[PDB]
Amino acid sequence: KIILNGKYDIANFNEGITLSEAIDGVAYKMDVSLVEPKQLKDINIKKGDKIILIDIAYESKKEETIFDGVVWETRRSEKSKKLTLSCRERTVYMEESEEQYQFKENTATQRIEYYCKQWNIPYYNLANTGKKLAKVIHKTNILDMIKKDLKETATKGGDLFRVRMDNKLKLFKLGTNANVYKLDSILEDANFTSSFNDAVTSVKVLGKSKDPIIGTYKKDADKFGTLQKIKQDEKIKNAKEAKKAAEAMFNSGEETISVDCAVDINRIRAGDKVSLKSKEYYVIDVTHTLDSRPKMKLNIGSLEYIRRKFY
Amino acid sequence: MIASKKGKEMLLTLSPIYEQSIIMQSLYEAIGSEFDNLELLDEEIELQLFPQSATWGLGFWENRVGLITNLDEDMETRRRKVIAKLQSKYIMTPKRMSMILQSYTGANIKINENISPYTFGVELTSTQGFPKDLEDLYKRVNVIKPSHLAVSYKLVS
Amino acid sequence: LDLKGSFLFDFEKGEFVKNADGTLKKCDKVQAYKQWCQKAILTPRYKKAAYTNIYGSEIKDLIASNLSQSAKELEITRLIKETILVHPYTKEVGEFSFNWLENSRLVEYEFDVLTIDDENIVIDG
Amino acid sequence: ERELPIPVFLTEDEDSVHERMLSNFQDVSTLEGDFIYDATRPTAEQIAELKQLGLQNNLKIAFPQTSYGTYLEWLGECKGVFKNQPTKATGVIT
Amino acid sequence: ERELPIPVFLTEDEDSVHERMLSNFQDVSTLEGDFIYDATRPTAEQIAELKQLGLQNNLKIAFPQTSYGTYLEWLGECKGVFKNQPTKATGVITFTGVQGTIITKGTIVTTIATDEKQSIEFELLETKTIGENETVDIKAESRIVGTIGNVSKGSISVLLGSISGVKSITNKEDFRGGTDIEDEEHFRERVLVAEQEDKLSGASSDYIRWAKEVDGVGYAYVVSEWAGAGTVKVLILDKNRKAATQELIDKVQEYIYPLNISEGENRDGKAPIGALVTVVTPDTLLINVKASFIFSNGFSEETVLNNLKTKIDKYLDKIDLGGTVSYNAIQAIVGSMMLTDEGIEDFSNLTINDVKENIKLQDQVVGIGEIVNE
Amino acid sequence: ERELPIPVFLTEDEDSVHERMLSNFQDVSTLEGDFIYDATRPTAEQIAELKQLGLQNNLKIAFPQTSYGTYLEWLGECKGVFKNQPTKATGVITFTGVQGTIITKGTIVTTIATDEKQSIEFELLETKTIGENETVDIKAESRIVGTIGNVSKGSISVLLGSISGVKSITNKEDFRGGTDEDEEHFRERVLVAEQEDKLSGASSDYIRWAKEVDGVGYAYVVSEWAGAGTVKVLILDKNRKAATQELIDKVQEYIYPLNISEGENRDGKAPIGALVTVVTPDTLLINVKASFIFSNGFSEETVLNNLKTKIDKYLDKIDLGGTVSYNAIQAIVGSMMLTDEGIEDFSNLTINDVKENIKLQDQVVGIGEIVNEVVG
Amino acid sequence: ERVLVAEQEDKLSGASSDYIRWAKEVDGVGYAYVVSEWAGAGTVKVLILDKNRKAATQELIDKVQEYIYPLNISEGENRDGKAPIGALVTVVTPD
């Protein structure tokens, strides 16, 4: 409804906005399509411009900044003067800037604070993930390093954390959204899919590092059969770490719902805890599309499958 | 018919079938009596939150300020003592001292600012007179005055 | 569903019916449902603050309205139907009939049909 | 003026109070418009209204950070501070 | 701690309210399970719950005695008391590494994490280079404010972000400071003290306050216009309520009323201008209690006697200069040891200075004497 | 009521039974409507019906966890537990009429039957005459057991017949004698009576039985206090005070009923031959005497009442057979002196004119009368 | 705000430091100096310099005097200034 840019208000030009995020996505993504007459052409929107989308929030019905990022790419058509943007929050910067860091044994929160301090990234008070990580040397992107240590934190019994940018970097635990919205009331169509596609019933740990930690921790072998994996990570250097990694991998296969909603719940985001029918599910992916009729589509799943796949 | 005001309001808030119902009328008469008592209790509670209208909360106020709680004493005397105790936490300028002593006694006071080098005079005035015992006023003046100063008194009807 | 009963209220006398023991005369599920239906019909809507917007009717407000005779018949049908149908036990209400006996003084009939009045198919594999 | 924090009890919802009242009933129907509902709902509504207005007003006037009027005047009198009083306009007329 | 003596009508039982409601009905059954009882009982429940939790709480949080949250802080502000905030811990880290290695401000160094404990983080406050001794001392603070930051020596031994050239780190001394948030009980005590204390200025009570502010002295007494108007005598005693040393008297004098003079700083003490304050040690009568003390199990005779002596010594503060020592009050203290189960089971033959009568001070203070068991 | 597990055989399906019957046929057609089907299917249906209803009902009534009615009554009789029987409502009915009129026992009077309600029948237990005064009172009883009856004050108004000269029949007060027992409550009683041992009525057993009664805090026993195997039961209430007479009677009836008639025997916990009596210790009253001197303007009554409350609070700590510390009471009095709560001075402090610690013996202690000596 | 400002804990005795602070609280007072018993009987002088070290004006002198020690009190009035009871105070400026 309001698109601030730097100074102007280009909400008087946009054909539609689509706010999309994935649980493992690089960044909260806003793809706003505009018509580009002389008026919009004058201001000369370039890549790197700062877009802030403001719309009436679902919670309190007050205008709140639902998106605050930067224009990552502009594509302009000439025959039809339709300028199209693809906005990203500043976690896209972290996913592109490579750097090598050597880390001793420590927790994920300390590592994230170290990254932010090194690269001068503003950040709120980061939640203590608690889990203690093994010494590693990293080379991938900063977001890649953060995701790697968060995955290793999900292993060893730690809670599932996800990093979202907003104005200043936030360490967002998955099941900690304020409002557990119920989608059954506006359920245009749902697609309950169940499978054994990524089911894990057994896991045979073969430790590449010593405390000779080896074991098997089959959990539902009698019911679904011995759907076995082999976890052979150097980071597992402990018997309890092996047991917790095994326990953080068992699941009954893929179990998700491809939900389609006729009303756009504005504040939904990846990782949020949302209800369909009596059950509760975590948002694997959300794709708003703020056309003339607000609309939302969701892909949600159980905790076990999400932990198995994305962690 | 219901006697309580709140009972009548609550009955009228329901469906109109209960015009002749003695049972529901008596029930909401009792409920309205309870709510009237609660409203009066709320007003009384509003009185207790202050030292001027403390009433039975004057005991709480006296316990707060450390004064000796004694129910047999006059309520106004307890109020005056509490106010004087509360007002003793700032500079002993003539205005503050005069109003503290006036609040304690309840009679008009004018501090003379005595001519002698290190004395201060206090003059009392009461249209209704005074009792024959006013020693506690002198005790409070001695406790409250600056240490190096002396004091003199006179009383007027 | 698990609907439950209530106590009788003789609308003719406007008093609860009580046994010789002094306790109020308990009644069955359907009896309490009929009592509720009559009470809801007699309760005006939006005016008795103890209730939500769902409960009550607006039949009394229709008397002062300027709509025609047939329009008032349709309004009465709509109002009674909407007022009754909020109850879960209700299945269907209809078969409305009207009789303008005097020039402008009306008598109307209606039928209420319960959830238990439904007819069940008999089949199993 | 500082915003007043309120206890959770004083800001209870009317429907929550009514549900707490109706929790004990399991034999008699508690539907809206029923006689049990008739007996119980106005009590809950009055409880919510009183608890939200009167008690919160008492809490507001209790302290000098939020008191007003005569209440704030008395709380000033607790520490011996008086508000300046008004005066009549004066002058000369020819 | 103090409890609010609430009236009974404001603390009615639920059953009493229900009975008062049921009393009105005349021609209807009011038994359990009937419509009237089952309909009025939730209302009685709600009325009692509102009365207690609303009115009692709202009345009692308005007073400092029974206020817990921000209301207590607001009352303390109203009477000029502020709750003590927590604070950082502070200390010095001894780095060890190759000379020329640069350690920068903002670097984090932590203690050793375990399966039980999260590592306690400390942030360097300075930027320095390792010296010729292959070491350097750098100040730091605990990032988390509280007593947890006050870790022991040699515990801060883990560097967060690897710095080339740093060989090892350690803390030679335990980190100090690290105050936590003040407890509600201590804040209530201080607020009540401010509420009940006069907090005057120039009066005898504030003179005693200024005396107590000086170290060494335990107790003090003041006489107004001892030598005519404009004169003040301050009479001080040590921690044992014995005669104060002349050095201590000089300390209190220079604190309150320096006898030396200067053009600008005439005296510039705590006393008002125009006062004539004299600081001395008083004449001190000694009151010794002699009795047959019988002591409870698990308590030492000497420790209980010393505690009783300290309590009587505290009572001597209530005894004013030239006041009267009460035999009955000392009996009360001695038996209050028993009522509090403080190591005394029985006592008898109680005498003070070998007499059983109240003793009047001839304008002397009373010093704590020995407590003698027969 | 516990859910009944059923064997798989008793819940067999009708079609399964019919298939088992028809498995042996391979030459003749077994289609629905065929003669073999005609001969076989009703047998299978009846087998399924009987096996599902009758046998499962037998299994249900077999055990007390699921039995009901007379079956549950018999299973209670197995371990000697009877369900409480109902009683007829009883009371008094007032009559008024000609003085010469005579009202006989067995007369039937009922309530007002209506469309909503039926009449409750009552019978008179006495024969009376109105000769002396125009109004008489006659005892009556309901002809139907149970909570039915127990009517309100003026419910009784109808006479089935017609008696000469009777002007009005009105019940004066509500009847109270009616009572029904719940099946589930009786089942719970049956299942509670399952104790294995500790039933001998030793000191521990009697202490446990006394503690089982509500309101009993502590219990003590004296063996052969009066010889012949007699047992005393000294009981303290929940707050260590002397047990009330009502509580004493409750415990007595629980352990050793005394109201047994000729055709009755004790159902209490006390076994045969064990004579039991419930007792409470004596409550010593500590009257305090001293020459109190009160502060300026303080009310003597209020200060003495506060001191009374404090000393009573202290005495509540003392148990049965405890020691009353006079030297502690001295400091209880002197605490108000320390706090300046009105008491300016005191002397000749005594407890019942005693200046030493008193030892209780078969006694609890409570606050007596606070008396100011006011010695001349 | 007046009620909440009146919350000072101590330093209320009217010593030399207290009088200097009170003089500094009045706007236009740069520096202040005190003479103890300049006229005996506990009298106090208050020598004041303006913000620019110059002699304080008569209006500023009157302002400081009224702030610390009012002189226009009537019969039915008492001093509300910072000076406690018995402390005679006068404001002066150097030549």
From TrEMBL, chain A:
Which part of the chain is the YqbQ/XkdQ domain?
A: 17-300
Q: A Pfam family this protein belongs to?
A: YQBQ
Instruction: Read off the InterPro entries from this record.
Output: YqbQ/XkdQ
The name on file for this protein is: XkdQ-related protein
UniProtKB/TrEMBL annotation, chain B:
User: What domain of life is recorded for the organism?
Assistant: Viruses
Protein name (Swiss-Prot/TrEMBL): XkdT-related protein
Top-level taxonomy: Viruses, Duplodnaviria, Heunggongvirae, Uroviricota, Caudoviricetes
From TrEMBL, chain C:
Q: What is this protein called?
A: XkdS-related protein
TrEMBL record, chain G:
Pinpoint the Baseplate J-like central domain residues.
13-92
Q: Of which family is this protein a member?
A: Belongs to the Mu gp47/PBSX XkdT family.
Q: Give the protein's recorded name.
A: Baseplate J family protein
Organism of this sequence: Clostridium phage phiMMP02
Tell me the stretch of the parent sequence this chain holds.
Answer: 190 to 284 of 378
